Amino acid sequence: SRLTAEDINGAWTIMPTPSTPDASDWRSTATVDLEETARIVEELIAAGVNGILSMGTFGECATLTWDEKRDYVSTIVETIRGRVPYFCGTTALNTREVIRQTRELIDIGANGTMLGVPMWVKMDLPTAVQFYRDVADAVPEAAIAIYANPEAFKFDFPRPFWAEMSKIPQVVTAKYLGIGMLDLDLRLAPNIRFLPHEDDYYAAARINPERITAFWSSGAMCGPATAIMLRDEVVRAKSTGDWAKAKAISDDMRAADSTLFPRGDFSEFSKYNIGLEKARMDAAGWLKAGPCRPPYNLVPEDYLAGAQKSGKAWAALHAKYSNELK
Amino acid sequence: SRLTAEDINGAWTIMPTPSTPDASDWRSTATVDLEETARIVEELIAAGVNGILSMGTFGECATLTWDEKRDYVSTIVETIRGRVPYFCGTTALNTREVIRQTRELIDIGANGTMLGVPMWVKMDLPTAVQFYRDVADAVPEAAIAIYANPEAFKFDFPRPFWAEMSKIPQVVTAKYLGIGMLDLDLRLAPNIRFLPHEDDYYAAARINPERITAFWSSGAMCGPATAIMLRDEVVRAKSTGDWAKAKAISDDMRAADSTLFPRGDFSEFSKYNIGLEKARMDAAGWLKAGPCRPPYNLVPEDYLAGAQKSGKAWAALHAKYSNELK
Amino acid sequence: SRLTAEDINGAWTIMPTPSTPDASDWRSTATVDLEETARIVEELIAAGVNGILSMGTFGECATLTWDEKRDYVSTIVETIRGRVPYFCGTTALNTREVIRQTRELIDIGANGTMLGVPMWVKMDLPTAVQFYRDVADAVPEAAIAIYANPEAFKFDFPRPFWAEMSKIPQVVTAKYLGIGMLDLDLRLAPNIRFLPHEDDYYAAARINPERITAFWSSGAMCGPATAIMLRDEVVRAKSTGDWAKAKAISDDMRAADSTLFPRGDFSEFSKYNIGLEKARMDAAGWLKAGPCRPPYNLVPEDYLAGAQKSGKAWAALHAKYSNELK
Amino acid sequence: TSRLTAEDINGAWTIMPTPSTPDASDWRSTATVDLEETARIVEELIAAGVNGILSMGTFGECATLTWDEKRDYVSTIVETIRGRVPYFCGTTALNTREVIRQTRELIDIGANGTMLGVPMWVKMDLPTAVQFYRDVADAVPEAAIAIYANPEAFKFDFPRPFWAEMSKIPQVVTAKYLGIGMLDLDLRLAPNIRFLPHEDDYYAAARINPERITAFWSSGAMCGPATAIMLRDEVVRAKSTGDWAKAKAISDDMRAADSTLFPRGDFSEFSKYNIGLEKARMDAAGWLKAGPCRPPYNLVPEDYLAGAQKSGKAWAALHAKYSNELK
Numbered sequence A, B, C: 001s002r003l004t005a006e007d008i009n010g011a012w013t014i015m016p017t018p019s020t021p022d023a024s025d026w027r028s029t030a031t032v033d034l035e036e037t038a039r040i041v042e043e044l045i046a047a048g049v050n051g052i053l054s055m056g057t058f059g060e061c062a063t064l065t066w067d068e069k070r071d072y073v074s075t076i077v078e079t080i081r082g083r084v085p086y087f088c089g090t091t092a093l094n095t096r097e098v099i100r101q102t103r104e105l106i107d108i109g110a111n112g113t114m115l116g117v118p119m120w121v122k123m124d125l126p127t128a129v130q131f132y133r134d135v136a137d138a139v140p141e142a143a144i145a146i147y148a149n150p151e152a153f154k155f156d157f158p159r160p161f162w163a164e165m166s167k168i169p170q171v172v173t174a175k176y177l178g179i180g181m182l183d184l185d186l187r188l189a190p191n192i193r194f195l196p197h198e199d200d201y202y203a204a205a206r207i208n209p210e211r212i213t214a215f216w217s218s219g220a221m222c223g224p225a226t227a228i229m230l231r232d233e234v235v236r237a238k239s240t241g242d243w244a245k246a247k248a249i250s251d252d253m254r255a256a257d258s259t260l261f262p263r264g265d266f267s268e269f270s271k272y273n274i275g276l277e278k279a280r281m282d283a284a285g286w287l288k289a290g291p292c293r294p295p296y297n298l299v300p301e302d303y304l305a306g307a308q309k310s311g312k313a314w315a316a317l318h319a320k321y322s323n324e325l326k
Numbered sequence D: 001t002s003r004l005t006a007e008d009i010n011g012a013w014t015i016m017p018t019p020s021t022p023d024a025s026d027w028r029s030t031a032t033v034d035l036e037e038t039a040r041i042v043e044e045l046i047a048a049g050v051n052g053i054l055s056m057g058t059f060g061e062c063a064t065l066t067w068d069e070k071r072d073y074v075s076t077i078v079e080t081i082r083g084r085v086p087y088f089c090g091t092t093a094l095n096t097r098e099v100i101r102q103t104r105e106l107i108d109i110g111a112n113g114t115m116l117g118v119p120m121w122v123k124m125d126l127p128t129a130v131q132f133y134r135d136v137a138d139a140v141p142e143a144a145i146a147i148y149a150n151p152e153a154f155k156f157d158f159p160r161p162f163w164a165e166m167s168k169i170p171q172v173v174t175a176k177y178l179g180i181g182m183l184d185l186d187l188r189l190a191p192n193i194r195f196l197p198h199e200d201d202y203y204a205a206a207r208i209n210p211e212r213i214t215a216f217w218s219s220g221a222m223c224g225p226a227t228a229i230m231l232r233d234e235v236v237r238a239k240s241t242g243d244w245a246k247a248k249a250i251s252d253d254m255r256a257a258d259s260t261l262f263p264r265g266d267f268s269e270f271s272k273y274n275i276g277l278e279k280a281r282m283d284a285a286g287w288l289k290a291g292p293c294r295p296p297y298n299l300v301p302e303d304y305l306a307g308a309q310k311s312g313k314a315w316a317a318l319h320a321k322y323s324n325e326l327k
Ligand SMILES: *[C@@H](C[C@@H](O)c1ccccc1O)C(=O)O
Pocket: A014, A055, A056, A057, A058, A059, A149, A197, A218, A273, A277
């Protein structure tokens, strides 16, 4: 009954935490738009998404209050009613707090936690390994998705880390970034379903068609048809050997993303991860992500425009692929 | 009335948060040794310290539970009974949590908060400036000490930031690191008492003897007589023009610190800031800092040994200077 | 007539610059073992290598004198006698010096230059683009291989740079590092043959089997049979669709490389790239790389041991795959 | 002339550019050094009372000059100075043998020393860097050495233990030093070296250690040297009287003049455009003609150039003000 790596296939969409209009103000106390939360979930299920992730960086795990988090997760779990797997996010400044939060949110009904590492003090390899072992020991029923983001969490999630995570049965998946070492990490970590970012799924699926069956998406929050079409066409390509349509969709996605990162730079992107993702979603018009909670509520205008252009581009793909789905 | 920069003078000692023997275990609750806490406070006051700071990096602001912090601050306040100023620490992942914590700990009776910036997402200049404005607006009774540590908080606390902080009345001081730009920062920020690290106090006090009248010390947790002697001798040097004795103390301090940083690297020290400072204090034998709360409870044995040697060296200074004091 | 991208296929092996016994001494003036140079070239040709690169970082382009370089290239050119393509390396501190060297080495009979960028001052995108345009304009008959090493050259060779290089006809190939963005770079640069590192060839050829027909090898300097076997088996996998044997070879290569990098870290490897590669080659016993020219003649002993072990592992692969080719 | 000592290095040490002809950005050009402007600059600096001349670091285009250009430039400087003030050439190169070759030649022409960074294609570690400088000093025992301690250019960060090692090499008499955060300690570790802070840090550094910190390096002097001369003179008087206010005010003026030089206030971004920004500043100040940048470093974003030009104008304004205070 605890999720397994084998159960993780297809399109895994990361949803934001919708905010109320006053959410940028430090005086506000209940800034989660719970009805927009429910609406997003039902829409994602209806689109055919395989699983839902949440409460990473752009999902504002860092900036929600604890009451906000419990209300958000409660609404998601009530809406899903067990139809698709759901991961909350419980990254925090220390092990004991992560355990506390993970227990409560799993109890409310999440299947797992998408989890980075404590980042006030930069972790080394043995520290990070111990940290995930501790969480899995404390909350054995929780599945774990490693949130392998070095910009946010400082630690760089190196090859030997993956070898160690593959020994922890609760660690079933990873929100993975660049795929330069995917070939080796798959070999080191046979028990983990590695999720590339949607734009890299095409390449990664070609490297290892047996293992690479799933990906994570934030572009889906601008309209999920694109990600659904990618998933479907890659399944087809694996069967027929004809990768041309999968390549065409993947190239479209890359172009849609081409203006997102300020000056092409993930490090500059990472300073504005929240505002840029939420602005992109706002601009696409598929969902209302809303204002960013403090302190990350200021984004330079030219960067915002890049994100908004990207949101329009993904909306255009959603309309194109909605028709191709029929 | 709220502490002013003018009132910040002399030796400001940063105390750890003493641990019980089980504190490394994620299963433990109530890991603060509150009696050792009280005993340290009384010893610091008896030594003649001007002010007490706490709950920075090595003070485990990151890894204490909220109940632990409340108990710790309560014990400190009851012990001090208003005789020296006291800063708690309330750095957290977002502005609302910082505000919440700061209000409570000030209400218990701390005079101010030693505060870095939220660090899951790296802050830019306008974000950092607005964050400190927000806290000051929200808790106008709290004095603020800027905890200007780029390794921990990613933000690098640049020149223009200091100019902005000088416009916020609550910002009375800074826990400052390298003094390469202290001359300019002093000009940009006339209203802030900049605290160099104890080892840099000699140089900084010669640069600007009118403004640089105070320093921060962790070495005092290995025996405060060194820091007290430095303070007293600098006051004398500023009056006589004879800096020989102040220089010799300051040079002893740098030597005592020479084995602390792994391979002389601040970045490598920063990965083990908690464990190395605590291990040094344990080794010096002036107080019992105790085990590190999870996750930061693993330190390479070579690095520990440098820390221990530094601890013994500072204990030797304390012995030497205790005799010169009386 | 100048090489084209279409003409670049199979195993492209990077040769060191063999040194005399006294080569680590600044007093020495003629440190290239020209007979070992000739021997290595004929052995690489006999093994069936497709082309030869030289005079990158471990090839000691930085530390050879000009007379040494000319003598080295003269010996290579006269040994090859037009049988396989050959690239010299002409990276230098400024455009004029690069041009002067490129003209003379091409005149002697190299087909092209493996070229990084001037690195005293870190280059930006338009500066780097102009640099390569200037070299191609000055020496129109030289093929260029982009040496895309950010550690050495500071510049990071971003996506827009590849789009620009594809417009320069002389730019036919790239010595490329991590393949995270290879899918996109191939799309942005249709006219370049991108050479992944031998360990990444498997994944890269699976990503794009039409475009990725070639790779670069330094492991071949420990015995080229492994690289020739990889090449041949990838050709067969592309035709049959059965990748298992190519995968086995590739996995073997990565295991042989697993001790090369100090602490698994490319940046720490990059500080000792010369001494580590040359020590690895010396240990494998296929060729005599010899001492490193000053200043890069000092390598920590444990790092050396890692490289020697890698050399032994690669030698063992060469003996294994020698038999499978016979 | 016996080799320079640290004790002989005092006052304002000005770093000169390598003046360029109008066609100097074109890779096709040879002889891009304006040798008459070179001579003129030297005589103007001597007339202003500078204590020593440095050259051929980063903005001095050590990386982008040809060898023939360097020889002509150094020959012109040496015949112009005619022994009146000490002079350092620059011989940083990609390897030890090339450094040695260039250093022997330029010393032989008549420079007193070399301002020397480390080979930077491969990032050096501590023992590698120490042996490099030992090798140069062994090879060219009559050259004084100025350590050019620039981590951005040279990758190596010139750590504390390195300075303890350099202090054992008699040839190493000075350092072009950057931020002063560890100056107090470096002085203690390296008793035999005259550390030169940047002109803007001289005030602070001289107050930290007035016995040891008697000299600084200046690129601002290339915009009009009166400011550097006045700073020098006023710090000498401050050390004697204990009244630092006038020295403080000049220093504060200098920092203000520098406030727009670094793109976004960032040393690392300035470092990408070190040549073009320094040379543009000097061109804007109008005291000398630095001229175009040799390839490849001939492209600078417009916004950044503008900050450099504003800085040049501000330093020209300081020169005019302090020229009047000098009488
Ligand atoms: C995960 C998503 C970010 O880490 C990220 C990474 C790469 C491209 C775009 C985005 O948003 C998260 O924010 O939880």
